[PDB]
Write a protein that binds this ligand. Sequence first.
Ligand SMILES: CCCCCCCCCCCCCCCCCC(=O)OC[C@H](COP(=O)([O-])OCC(O)COP(=O)([O-])OC[C@@H](COC(=O)CCCCCCCCCCCCCCCCC)OC(=O)CCCCCCCCCCCCCCCCC)OC(=O)CCCCCCCCCCCCCCCCC
Ligand SMILES: CC(C)=CCC/C(C)=C/CC/C(C)=C/CC/C(C)=C/CC/C(C)=C\CC/C(C)=C\CC/C(C)=C\CC/C(C)=C/CC/C(C)=C/CC1=C(C)C(=O)c2ccccc2C1=O
Ligand SMILES: CC(C)=CCC/C(C)=C/CC/C(C)=C/CC/C(C)=C\CC/C(C)=C/CC/C(C)=C\CC/C(C)=C\CC/C(C)=C\CC/C(C)=C/CC1=C(C)C(=O)c2ccccc2C1=O
Ligand code: HEM
Ligand code: HEM
Ligand code: FES
Ligand code: FES
Lengths: 110, 536, 55, 380, 380, 30
Amino acid sequence: SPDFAKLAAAQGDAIDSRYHPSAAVRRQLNKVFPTHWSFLLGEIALYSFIILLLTGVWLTLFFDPSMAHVTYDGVYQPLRGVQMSRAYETALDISFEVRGGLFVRQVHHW
Amino acid sequence: SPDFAKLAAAQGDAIDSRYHPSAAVRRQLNKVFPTHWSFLLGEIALYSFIILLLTGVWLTLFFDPSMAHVTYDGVYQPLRGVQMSRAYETALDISFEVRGGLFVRQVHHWAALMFAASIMVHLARIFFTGAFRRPREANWVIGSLLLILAMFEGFFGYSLPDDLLSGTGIRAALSGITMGIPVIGTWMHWALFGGDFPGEILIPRLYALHILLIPGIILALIGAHLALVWFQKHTQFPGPGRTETNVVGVRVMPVFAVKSGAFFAMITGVLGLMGGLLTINPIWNLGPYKPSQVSAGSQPDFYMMWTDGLIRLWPAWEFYPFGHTIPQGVWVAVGMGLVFALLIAYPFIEKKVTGDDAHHNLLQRPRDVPVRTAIGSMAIALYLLLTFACMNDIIALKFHISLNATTWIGRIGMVVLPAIVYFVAYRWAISLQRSDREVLEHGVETGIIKRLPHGAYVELHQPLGPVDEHGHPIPLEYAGAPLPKRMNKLGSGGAPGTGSFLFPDPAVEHEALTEAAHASEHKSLTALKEHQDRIH
Amino acid sequence: GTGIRAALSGITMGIPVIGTWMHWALFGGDFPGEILIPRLYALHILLIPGIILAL
Amino acid sequence: PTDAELAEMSREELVKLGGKIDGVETIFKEPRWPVPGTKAEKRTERLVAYWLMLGGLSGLALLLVFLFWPWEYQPFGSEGEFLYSLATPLYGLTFGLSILSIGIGAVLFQKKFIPEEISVQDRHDGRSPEVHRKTVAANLTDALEGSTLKRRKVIGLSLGIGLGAFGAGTLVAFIGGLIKNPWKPVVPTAEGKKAVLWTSGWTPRFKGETIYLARATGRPGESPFVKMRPEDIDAGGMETVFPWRESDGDGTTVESEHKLTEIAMGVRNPVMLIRIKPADMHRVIKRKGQESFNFGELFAYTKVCSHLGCPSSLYEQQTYRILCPCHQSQFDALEFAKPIFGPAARALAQLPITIDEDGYLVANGDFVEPVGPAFWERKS
Amino acid sequence: PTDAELAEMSREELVKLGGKIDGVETIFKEPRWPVPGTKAEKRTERLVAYWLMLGGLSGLALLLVFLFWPWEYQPFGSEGEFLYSLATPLYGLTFGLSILSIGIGAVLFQKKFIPEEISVQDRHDGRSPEVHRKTVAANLTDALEGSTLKRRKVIGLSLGIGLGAFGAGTLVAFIGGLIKNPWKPVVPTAEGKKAVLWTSGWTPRFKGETIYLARATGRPGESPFVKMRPEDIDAGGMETVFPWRESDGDGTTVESEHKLTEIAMGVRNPVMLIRIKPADMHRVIKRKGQESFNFGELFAYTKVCSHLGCPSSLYEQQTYRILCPCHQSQFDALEFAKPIFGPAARALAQLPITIDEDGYLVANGDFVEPVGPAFWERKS
Amino acid sequence: GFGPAPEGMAMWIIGMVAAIGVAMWIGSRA
Ligand SMILES: CCCCCCCCCCCCCCCCCC(=O)OC[C@H](COP(=O)([O-])OCC(O)COP(=O)([O-])OC[C@@H](COC(=O)CCCCCCCCCCCCCCCCC)OC(=O)CCCCCCCCCCCCCCCCC)OC(=O)CCCCCCCCCCCCCCCCC
Ligand SMILES: CC(C)=CCC/C(C)=C/CC/C(C)=C/CC/C(C)=C/CC/C(C)=C\CC/C(C)=C\CC/C(C)=C\CC/C(C)=C/CC/C(C)=C/CC1=C(C)C(=O)c2ccccc2C1=O
Ligand SMILES: CC(C)=CCC/C(C)=C/CC/C(C)=C/CC/C(C)=C\CC/C(C)=C/CC/C(C)=C\CC/C(C)=C\CC/C(C)=C\CC/C(C)=C/CC1=C(C)C(=O)c2ccccc2C1=O
Ligand code: HEM
Ligand code: HEM
Ligand code: FES
Ligand code: FES
């Protein structure tokens, strides 16, 4: 049967025996920050940057950045047989031929 | 007018008033690191990591990672009008149409080898000296992921030029091994290539893994790896003043800022010579990758060679359980994770079989550990066999043996040679231990004989300790510290007389210098001795 | 693409400090060239977000 | 320890006070050259300086072998081939030799001028004091028990469902974009829309397509194919032949995209056109199903080997082997390419051959086996 | 502060001891719900639970509207076009509304259940204590004055030469690989291999090339350039025409590379074949140099405008203005395309026009000015 | 004469001998 109290105490004794982050952690935890609405404005630029990481690491699994010319012959019906770069054809494969790839592309621009 | 004295204090007071890093700079400027040559083996893997970042950023803005077919129409005359990928044209443009572009490309492949070589040398310091036992377990595991990433980060590196030698490695590894996996093997192949091999999206996926993701993980693990050695007070060998709760070495500011910064200048200097003098990856000789041609052989770089030899030596063993099949290539994919599982989880295997769960801060000298020295050299001799069996198209041709006999010395030897290196290294290690006890009980074997006046050839040992009223010495106690075996190393050689290599100093200035050599090697000797007695 | 032709190819072509010598150094030739977007893919993934995340 | 005393302490007594705070104790620190008038100190400060001047002379050489040098590529039979071949070696022994000599010249400043100091620092590792183990454990547990979350089995239980059903949301949204279906009907054969691994380029698009066993005229992709007479080769010709579907042709940009889908995108297309000598035919064993897949001492086996898929090109015309260059499997061409060595366990797929009415080599349809290196869903 | 007393200090008494070490004094800290059974606690612990169950239901919806939704692309007048237009909104209001509701429920747990506290922490910034300022400035300078680098004028001067000649070695080797010459002779014109930016496609390769003013037939990627008669357009032309080599044709892959380097790989090619009505001919002011570059109420000005190089395309057939969309320059086609407006200060380079003997439009060579957006080494 | 097998030989006996052999000159033996 799980306990999660004796199992969490012997894990803290294991960390504090290998390492010793006792006085180091408590000063970081006991750090006092002012509660004001304006002091969260910098966190929006910190949290939008993490979303640009997570949706940009995804978005480079499907993007081919070259400029070599190739006809389309894909799925978008107006742009059929148009001399395009491969950077534009895979940017039209994220939008159209990847399941929910237009969503992750649009989140990443917003 | 420049001063650089008043400006050095007026700027240091501006840092120490806006910020206040003096109660935190000093605690990491009085940090003590042990001076030992083995403790610089991990810095070779770090100083080659920075050169791979610096030389990598250069050719990141010249390389085009697509697989779109394009004729060459450039400067290299044998490759003219050849259907090649765009990743192979812009790797033939770095080599040929950029000033100093082949140099930066060659340094970047040699630094990739020095990165992966000086990991394996650095694993061999950690394993044999026992630098992983009680507090350093997580630093082994955070460590040993950097070996597994450096296998794949390098393998994703030379796959990018889309060479004929390099493309058949992708067909072997990423399309042959990852298609015979039994639970899902074909679903994993379409989730990696976007279709059947080759496809169109492979080399862009192997470009983003290789520039953003895996160096983003390696640099984040290294920062978590060097913090766990900065803030856990680096291990030391036992010795005169080394007593399990001290760090007897040198500080950070005058020394180890110099001998670790000058060592970065030399490791960059060695790779500058090797990247200039020695050609590494001549990708213009073998042509572009097209699936209808091969080269005379196919083999990876030396860090991924033990996987290629692991393919060649397991025989044609397949099972066919139902209307499915289980090919020979899954014996490597289960034989690569099993090697990686034993290497990540080793500090938890040894404490289970020994019960060694006490806090260790003094390194084990690897002759004092006869089993783990023997288990280690079992695993070197299995690595050295698997990395020489993948180049048996070269042992057969250049060393004139056979192509069939080299696999059977790799098949019979895969069982035999790790078993007869375990024996000879468990018996090398104990036989070094008995050599350390013939120098404590009897003394350092000086060469000089002295026939006595009744015959009786003797050897005139130097006792390394106190003496009895009889000619025998008192036996010392072993303490894990390396014992001297030669008398010149105990300072019995002397000084050759100071001066240049051709013309001597006037010998009044010699006796003033050699007196300060026997008063600084003796003030240092009575400094460790009066500190060793202060502890005990 | 016309934003690149306006900004990176019109402003960098008329700088009096050095001239048009920079224009062949960030395009590899005349606009559009061939190594524009793979140079703007390297900067935009590792080189600039490796400085943003370091800052 | 008090400002009344720090106004008169010397610089050495402040280094010792800075080490008592950290436990650092330099036991021994003596300068390298205690004798002022030495004349051996003056020839070891130049011995350090000679390496640092070489690091400046070589960096100035790297600046001048980079600008003033023929870096241009020159071919093998040209005039400036030798002077080009010393461009990148001169980029190495002038770049790397500079900081190799600044690295030596800065070690020699540490070996010879920075004073040898032996410092002992007591590591305080192993275990935190009790006044710090206890004020953290009574701060993390007070942040969890003062939060009143353990008494609220409805918030804390629905949070695990909330973060669970969201964590199942992203890990399917992050992964399910690139999970293709490997058995989707794509390739339009005669049976109609087969899979990809079951089709090989030799599969007929309709009933009577008559794929030709056409070789290439060297560098097979951009080169136009040409048909192959059966009397072209004599004894172990091993000519690589590609699927030429008798309507492709070369010369125009519309039907030049077909020839790149036969080679540079097309795996499992090439086959070897092995010609067995007529003197040794009694030592030929046919396969069970593949009994008449030959036309008169002409055998057609694939280059794509049956273990990880390298093209097995080396043939060794004397003894009928099909040795593969990657992992050296040695398929025995007289015995339906059964492997007689190596890690490969399966035969190469044999292709049937029948001469055309005009007199050219034609395949009788696809293989019996898939050519691929043993995916999980393979029958055998 | 001593282990004999830490065994009996309660969990509240150790937080205050854990804060006085760190300088943190929780002045006020009181739990949110002092009365145990209130029936308003039981409806605000379900209200937190409802926002967390909303994320566990909307996150489960994003698992099910991702796998089980017709995400495939459908054209504009198709049958399942409406279910495609709700694909990516259904990925938005199920992903984002899940963690918005998890984020709302985790704020409403903090606002309503985690106790309000006002902690004060004295920042010790501004200046270090004197014992730390003094044992660092005497520790940095002891590693400099004790290192004996100041007296050694030979090493410290050759170290600046040594590291200086290596810093000037890398920063030329790292940078000078990507520095090209804009004035190297590349394009082989008739005037002895003139450099780039003086060649714009209309420069004749030899004396009588006769580059035709050829238009595009719509979608100019794989479109053959048909010729243009001068009577093809009535009035108010706006026909973007291109250089034509009169050796290309269409259909072959060798000459299809000449039309890929014509438009997409070749800038400053397209010009505007503008036709002027015959009613307004006296209100035409020719340029001083470009006096006779017209043939029968026709003119040919570049699309590439004289300021930052966007294609100017808007025609303004009532009052002749060549408004460009990027920065609104508004050239005046009756006044040799002198600008009326915008940031452009220079005119457009007129191309000469002459009819063929067969009756097609032929350019009489190149321009007079370069077409480009005012590069530095410009003669005009 | 090329390929990754002479790369491996010329790494261990040239590059890593001159990296260990320098480390043995800088560091000490204890
Ligand atoms: C060539 C391939 C490899 C290239 C790498 C080159 C660099 C590798 C070594 C780097 C050495 C560190 C460099 C700085 C140290 C400078 C010496 C010093 O001031 O203090 C002494 C220093 C003091 O050390 P310590 O910390 O104070 O304490 C030591 C104790 O006193 C007493 O300690 P102990 O009792 O324990 O024993 C001391 C000694 C044990 O005693 C020894 O064994 C002495 C060894 C003497 C080395 C002989 C030269 C090395 C290479 C020979 C190549 C000949 C050409 C062949 C060409 C064939 C063409 C057909 O152990 C060691 O010092 C470890 C040395 C490790 C190197 C062993 C080499 C193993 C494999 C050899 C293969 C070489 C690659 C061949 C590839 C194919 C051919 C290209 O001791 C040394 O390190 C001596 C090293 C000797 C190397 C000197 C030459 C530098 C190498 C560059 C050559 C190019 C210049 C020559 C042409 C220019 C003409 C003017
Ligand atoms: C991108 C990136 C770098 C990511 C890394 C971020 C990351 C993952 C960090 C994780 C850090 C981890 C895991 C820390 C755990 C380590 C640990 C046990 C911490 C507990 C703290 C502890 C034991 C005591 C408390 C210490 C205390 C009260 C105060 C210390 C604060 C002080 C004095 C200074 C600030 C810290 C600071 C500036 C540290 C710099 C030290 C570092 C990281 C140097 C890097 C470094 C360099 C540069 C070397 O060249 C080197 C060469 C040879 C060996 C080692 C190193 C080495 O560590
Ligand atoms: C030390 C170790 C592997 C400990 C692991 C113990 C453990 C937990 C084992 C369980 C896991 C298992 C079963 C592992 C099996 C091994 C395996 C398959 C993978 C592990 C790979 C690995 C980490 C290897 C590290 C060991 C290693 C190769 C070298 C240690 C460095 C040492 C001790 C000496 C180097 C000496 C040196 C610098 C120069 C000598 C020059 C020579 C002759 C080097 C020998 C040599 C080598 C080593 C090449 O790799 C090589 C590759 C390509 C061409 C040629 C060579 C070559 O000549
Ligand atoms: C096989 C992977 C690795 C493992 C298991 C490993 C393990 C360790 C351990 C246990 C230590 C500390 C020894 C001590 O406390 O004395 C250490 C130190 C160190 N490691 Fe590694 N390491 C590995 C790879 C690397 C890599 C790739 C680098 C390059 C960045 C590196 C750089 C260092 C540095 C700088 C130190 C501190 C100084 C030293 O002891 O050399 N390590 N490593
Ligand atoms: C530190 C771990 C790294 C290792 C071990 C490594 C290894 C390699 C190797 C072996 C190659 C092939 C060299 C060749 O083509 O001959 C390569 C190529 C390349 N690497 Fe890395 N690399 C690393 C990091 C990086 C980073 C961080 C970048 C991004 C700045 C990068 C960018 C590149 C590029 C663009 C190439 C292709 C250049 C070419 O093909 O010549 N690498 N790398
Ligand atoms: S390639 Fe023929 S067996 Fe692996
Ligand atoms: S770009 Fe059209 S005027 Fe500036």
